[model samples]
Target: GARREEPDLRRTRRPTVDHNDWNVEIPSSFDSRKKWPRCKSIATIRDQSRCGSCWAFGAVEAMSDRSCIQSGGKQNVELSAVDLLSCCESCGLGCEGGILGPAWDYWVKEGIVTGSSKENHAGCEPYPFPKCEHHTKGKYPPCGSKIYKTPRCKQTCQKKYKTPYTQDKHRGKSSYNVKNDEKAIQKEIMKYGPVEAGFTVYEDFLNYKSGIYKHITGETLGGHAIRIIGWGVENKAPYWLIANSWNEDWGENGYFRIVRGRDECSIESEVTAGRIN
Candidate 1:
């Protein structure tokens, strides 16, 4: 249930200094999970369930990771995808699909609350949807062809949660796009944390099981948003390790590798990230 759109160029901003200009040696392999193991959010995989809220998932997952990373791995907060998915009107049509840029902008302007998955219930506003299987056989029931309607925006915390909705809010200090260059993207992830990227998904992607993925044969399945966590080489092929919102049981324990540097499926073109306040 991934959807993609071209961001409005007038409103989005890019970093002034190119990361490649910094001249730091880009590592041959990097993994946020290894770099910041204390930040549990970086390793956690989330399920968007049956909604087309992958955009919100991608934005908040990366935002949540950076929050902990920026705090030296002390502030382990899970920013609410449900809050951003439902409340941010400018973010697009809720579960129908949304763009990545406005979601980050909304974090700075309107703040998101701490939240967890439906089962964890560790935060003020846990995601309400039940987990469902996607593309592969799993413990959860299959997410059928029909997409679920977006959950309504609610400002209050869960009844049992102690924090007020206002008190649970987390905001970003800045938001911007990373340069489309490969090294620039790597540098950004290395310095801060993971990044949210939207790319063209083809039908064959739905059948992806393992190995560095390259588009082979399939019809266009529209756009998909995911978190790029790290990079490494596999059997002489270089790849970007990515986390998906489809759950842990799918795609290499909820992660997959894609060809890097070539801008496969335009994945490198629209990378976005933010800084924690």
Candidate 2:
């Protein structure tokens, strides 16, 4: 749906942490899927369709998961990627591309609420990629299709999506940057929930089927954003567990793992996260 563009990092507010003050001990291994039950803290995977809204999905999905995690299963909210993607004009183009920093800025300043799927609760606007069938085709429009366009933002939710027309919108209390350290990223994930991460997507990444992914080959397309849920050692190689927006059939059942501790794909270099109020 959107064209590619360099993320405007100069305008974003990256998450911050005091390396000296961060004393939490993070286990060597962690996984959100196992740590939190499905629909509790581990949010269901979402598709960005053919749009470049992966940026929006990462931020919204992480926030939704954190909201549920912090509430101790009291709230099962799915924050509106539509709200962030369409209305966050100051962040970037709706579908073209965006940065996670402005995403948190929008969340902190404006706020979003429960957007549901078509088959599920139907409490909020469903993602526009319902008809997408490629499963794991990371980017959208397919190889030979036209570019997908982002839909206009609307305020009202449907009957099944909204109970009283008025909805509860959650805002982020604050957002900061985490140091470019693996241990720090682990602590943030173990403390808050999944985090928004951006990394370079080389052409070889498209052919990734399994195994800890590292740049094998192919030209660099650009940077893509995703959710980092956990990390572990697989076949003796440490990898970061990623929640991708390209759909499940694309990577490791809609997820992917990258070689950890090496700044793989610049993944460790630009880790971004925030919390909800």
Candidate 3:
């Protein structure tokens, strides 16, 4: 397949942030080396089942961390992953594709709460969370408030943007994005207490039934969101601490560390939007 041409990079600058521990300013052509630390935090992961709804994982992860942090370690709430998996897709464009920036924005602006997944999810027979059964329900509020103003380039009277791409394709923002690099990404992570960043994995990933990945190439297989807690090294290989919502059976019980050297994160930190810490 012919490769799609690379588009211009966008700049994600923050007036409130400065200083970066990232080893590089701009990511290299490829990455596959870096050490990741072990994340002992009590974060929950829920599988979106066979659906390609990685965005839900990103939304819940961010909320879970904050809940844990705010609850003074007294609240380790199990939120409804399906709510996010099924909704907010307006900007997400369904399937298993979406980004984290919009997910965070939705959370901060709208404030989604905990609800039982049994009421709305289509996977795993819906066992409910923090406790099984219909009584212990997790609830989420509709996150759309009137704070953000729509710009002419993004307004759609006829239909909602189905495929949520970074650059506005029709308005000519297709190739551009809300830019972020290694250092800036770390800052974002620090503020968010771990966030799920999307990566363009290859189709071959479908057949990947083994050890961690430091994917080097391929067409944008599909973008899926993941939670970023921290970084460290294991066995001398560098990795990113990410929580996966693909079930505990998938990778190290709902988590996998990606090789951080070769830009293994295809679309990694290239684009990002998230909740305030």
Compared with the true structure, what per-residue lDDT tens digits does model 2 show for residues 1-277? 2222234553244436745677877787998877878555374777776677888998888888887887777777888777788878767877888776677777877887667643454556666555353423543435334446877877777656535433467788777666778888888888888988889888888778888899978998888888999999976889999998876557787888998998987888667777764
Q: What local lDDT score does residue 177 receive in model 2, on the 0 to 100 scale?
A: 63
RMSD of each: 1.5, 3.3, 12.6
For model 1, the stretches where C-alpha displacement exceeds 4 angstroms are 1-17
Per-model TM values vs. the true structure: 0.96, 0.88, 0.58
| lDDT value, candidate 3, whole model | 0.45
Tens digit per residue, CA lDDT, model 3, 1-277: 1111123212332122333544544322221112212222334555454344467565565565655554445554444444444445433543335545445445554434443344443222232322111111124322221112211222111133242222211110111222345555555555435655667667555444445676645555556666666565667776676776655555555567776635675644543434333
lDDT of 1 by residue, 15-36 (tens): 4224755888889999999999
lDDT of 1 at 215: 95
Q: State the displacement of the C-alpha of residue 220, model 3, in Å, after optimal TM-score superposition.
A: 4.5
Per-model CA lDDT versus the true structure: 0.88, 0.74, 0.45
Backbone collision count in every prediction? 0, 14, 29
Kindly state the number of residue pairs that clash in model 1. 0
